[model samples]
Target: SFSFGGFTFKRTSGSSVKREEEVLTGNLQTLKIRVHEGYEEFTMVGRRATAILRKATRRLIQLIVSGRDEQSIAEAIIVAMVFSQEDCMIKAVRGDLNFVNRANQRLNPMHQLLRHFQKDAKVLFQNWGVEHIDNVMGMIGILPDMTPSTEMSMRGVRISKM
Candidate 1:
């Protein structure tokens, strides 16, 4: 059963509610995180975007101060602004842990069994620093304009293109 308001999820075998009712991987699974289609899609796309945005925004301050060109300064400003908003939105959604009870109430439990899903799939809240986050997001295809942290690779490859 999927209960959103309470953020409870369960897998009942039949119409009866029993203490022995299983919450296992095979029989069934509960997700406190309500899986809206849009939410899923947004998550799929926005997760890394948000991560990269967070990282890029954090570094934007330094870049803005050191930037030599109008374009770099503007990029610094835009990246900072955009990264802040996207990262905030993503964190707000991921904070569903805070909204567990609220989520349970929102879910439509067909079996009428109320129980917490008590699980999460994501690795963590913040997995990387801002600069590396930008790289990680880029490595995973999250950001379109991910720049390298250093201009030259260890072998002087100049991977960052200046």
Candidate 2:
């Protein structure tokens, strides 16, 4: 759970709140450092399309820079901004807006961006310095692996006799 102005937010299975919850509760100090390190990256999208970002999105960025707001709220703002700016995700990454929670999970904005904009996905990953395409695919919720070890294959040969 996370707290705001006299309000607390609970996690939901389908809501981005879960993502924000991770950052706030997962070690806020660490999360803050990550956000700071990627400071320029976070604002790149806004810089690229000043005319496109509305007050709501801009507020989020401001709140993040304040360094006094709740981490969850700050993260939630980034998530919302990414969704609203479909054309700015790659630019955000290019600006070095890199961040990950304790579990190494990124905000869903990148995932959603990659899903709808396949052409931009390559550039986004390239900018973020992600080398393993498969790992990134899983992180973005594009590839789900559920097969058993016995069903795995190595260069066309089954790992198990079965």
Candidate 3:
């Protein structure tokens, strides 16, 4: 079970990762988001494909743990790719040795750059005045309320009668 924010996440295995895959794929397909062979969807699809690759991992683990000698290195490698995003699985599994791990790190630096550049980018779009502006503004929200820090008392109280 997954836990977050002081609460245990309640989840059923049903309609979890696979379902997210279907939904994302369906939405992207419907939206024509992957036009003219330009998309990172090939990679993004791997994030959802991870669930299906567990069996390969299980097989590899079984062999390793059971001390099976002279196992195929390819199987272990394939399992690793399967656990990765689809494009990653494809590139490496399909023998593209040059694809960098930076694909994931790109998401971070890109998101950070997005943060750095957001003000200008958003201001540019402000002219549109469309409701879809909220889509780009997904992270816009107030932070949780927090009490100001205060020192705790350690002294024991003395009994006093009035």
Candidate 4:
């Protein structure tokens, strides 16, 4: 399940990962957003692509849990990409190998992942606005309120007997 802004998503438990792949990967098909008076439902269509996404998400989750800022989120993603896919650009850039290899001829998967997310996010942000983005980031513990910081706490929390 994933929550963003006013939208909440859940895939029938047995098919969750596959459903995420459909929305996060190629063409990403369709995302249906239905808003009710006090709630929203997000419907995504399809099945899982790879276990890679789960790995990637876990690192991202860990970064958030460790109180790392959003930048760390990116770093964690790149690290996952390096591990899952290949760091093609870095290897090609540092080339002294002078040999033809498919690995050296491709862009980094993590870079591709970031581009995919960024492009998708740009569209979503344009459609949903900062409030939604802030909500999602907060939901994921990525930000306190869109201001970049590494501190973790309920900054304005107050305890009272009610």
Candidate 5:
């Protein structure tokens, strides 16, 4: 039911510390994550692969927000390489600012980094006869539409009614 990676951890309290091997296992369908403030819980539901993808996406966002553009790009490329080898579908809840900025050609320090990676990584897939490297896109999936100000409301009351 589980796999163990060749890594161990030890307890620090005892003079003679006891080490235990770490166990790695597949994800469950439901995942619980904490928000930035740790005051509330966020839950996600999906297949094991999707859960893994979501976790990776969250980490990628964290890296991007922390201004670790190089690490983020490397991590994203590694993830794309591994995930593309599988048959699972990768999706993201929202597109990160880097992806959006690449589209608009905005002035930013890490602008178009993802695009460059996608362009260069496509050559790796060409040997496998994968012409369209969909998994290496700036963002994995089509994000939900977030059109601005189509409707407004206050305290559950529609703007038209007010």
Candidate 6:
């Protein structure tokens, strides 16, 4: 049983929460980082993509560690939804970390959940396709740089010392 927003909720079964943790652990293991090699640009992009998913997974684990089971499930769902978005896909292909970071911040306030249903949330993002590094790079070729003009303008003013 748990309380939220001043309401008390009861668990139907004691083992259900434990089972959810087991499933989440298995899915997290499946997403463990692997090394990649390529030209510096390709490797950097691939690493960044992997890092994004891994960091999301870590945050889920952190929530679980703090005994925030409901919040962990909510976060998992949000991470999956964000990663699955068209905007996120494009930004990811462009290697835009700022967009991804802002999207995460925007979603954090909305974390709001069931055990069996939450199990699927963990699976939803487990196969987030970080393996498609080549495809990401291909998309990057056709997409224009969408970084803000202020940053672009500063690029010209900053002198290269090297």
Q: For this target, which candidate reaches the highest TM-score against the unseen true structure?
A: 4
Q: Compared with the true structure, what per-residue lDDT tens digits does model 1 show for residues 1-162?
A: 332212222322212112222222222343322211111111001111211111222121221112334334223323233222222222322322223235465433211212212232122112212322233221221121333343211110111111
Clashes of each: 14, 2, 2, 2, 0, 0
lDDT string for model 2 (1-162, tens) is 443222233322222211121122111221221121111122212211111112222122221111122342223333334333322333433322344546887735334333333323334323222112222111211111212232221111111111
Model 5: how large is the Cα RMSD against the reference? 19.4
Q: Please list the residue runs of candidate 5 whose C-alpha ends up more than 4 Å from where it truly belongs after superposition.
A: 1-67, 86-162
lDDT (CA) per prediction: 0.23, 0.26, 0.20, 0.26, 0.23, 0.22
TM-score of 4: 0.22
lDDT string for model 6 (1-162, tens) is 333222232322212111111111222221112112111110001111111111222121110011123343233333333322212222222111111133455211112112222334333323322221122211211101211122221110111111
Q: Which portions of model 1 miss their true places by more than 4 Å?
A: 1-64, 86-162
Clashing pairs in 6: none
The 10-residue segment of model 6 with minimum total lDDT is 39-48
- lDDT comparison, 1 vs 5, better candidate: 1
lDDT score at residue 107, model 2, on the 0-100 scale: 39
TM-scores of all predicted structures = 0.16, 0.20, 0.18, 0.22, 0.17, 0.16
Error of 2 at 105 (Å): 13
For candidate 5, give the lDDT. 0.23
Residue 120 in candidate 3 has what lDDT?
27
Using lDDT as the measure, name the better of candidate 3 and candidate 5: 5
Error of 5 at 40 (Å): 23
lDDT of 5 by residue, 39-78 (tens): 1111212122111211232121111111123333333433
lDDT of candidate 4 over 1-162, digit per residue (tens): 653211233423222122122112224322221111211222321121111122222111111122134443333333332222222212222212123225665333334444343323333222211222223333332222334333332221111111
Model 1 lDDT, residue 118, Cα: 22
